[PDB]
Amino acid sequence: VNSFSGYLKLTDNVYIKNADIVEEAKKVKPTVVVNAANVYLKHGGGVAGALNKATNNAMQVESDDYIATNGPLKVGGSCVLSGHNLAKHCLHVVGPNVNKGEDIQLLKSAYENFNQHEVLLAPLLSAGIFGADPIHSLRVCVDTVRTNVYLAVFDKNLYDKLVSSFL
Ligand SMILES: C[C@@H](O)[C@H](CO)Nc1ncnc2[nH]ccc12
Ligand SMILES: [Cl-]
């Protein structure tokens, strides 16, 4: 039993809700919140910009030190950093950005990072401003993640579309 509330159950381990991931994280304070990161951990817009803003830019400061030490992530890769005031940990995961020409096949690799954590709050990877089809992202999530994932979909219209089309 966990403290996530109001989610629709899609499969044994995948759940979905129309919600602002920032407000969800502030309420639940999960062990792991997933950020829709880029390889430079530059949290400018979309989920990343919103999460970072909610940390008063502390996420960006921590991320800049991470990059200065380790260099960029790989597309499909991840790193674990602090969750600041939002969660215990933030799993920064880089899905392919279609608006950059990156290989959508890497979306499965991106979701594989979730399997290293028993429970996560997360967005749909490569959706939104990353330019991939969210219906496809949800399908890859369900077919790749085996741990317990609570998906927050900001757009109510898209949420209704994802549920009604879910196979
Ligand atoms: C891009 C997809 O992940 C989804 C599409 O609606 N975007 C979001 N989902 C949840 N919380 C969010 N906070 C800011 C953006 C956002
Ligand atoms: Cl977005």
UniProtKB/Swiss-Prot annotation:
May form homohexamers. Interacts with N protein. The chain holds residues 1025 to 1191 of 7096 of the full protein. Changing residue 31 to A: In strain: Mu/B.1.621. Inhibited in vitro by GRL-0617. The gene is rep. It catalyses: Thiol-dependent hydrolysis of ester, thioester, amide, peptide and isopeptide bonds formed by the C-terminal Gly of ubiquitin (a 76-residue protein attached to proteins as an intracellular targeting signal). Responsible for the cleavages located at the N-terminus of the replicase polyprotein. Participates together with nsp4 in the assembly of virally-induced cytoplasmic double-membrane vesicles necessary for viral replication. Antagonizes innate immune induction of type I interferon by blocking the phosphorylation, dimerization and subsequent nuclear translocation of host IRF3. Also prevents host NF-kappa-B signaling. In addition, PL-PRO possesses a deubiquitinating/deISGylating activity and processes both 'Lys-48'- and 'Lys-63'-linked polyubiquitin chains from cellular substrates. Residues 1-167 form the Macro domain. It is found in: Host endoplasmic reticulum membrane. It is a multi-pass membrane protein. It comes from Severe acute respiratory syndrome coronavirus 2 (2019-nCoV). This is Papain-like protease nsp3.
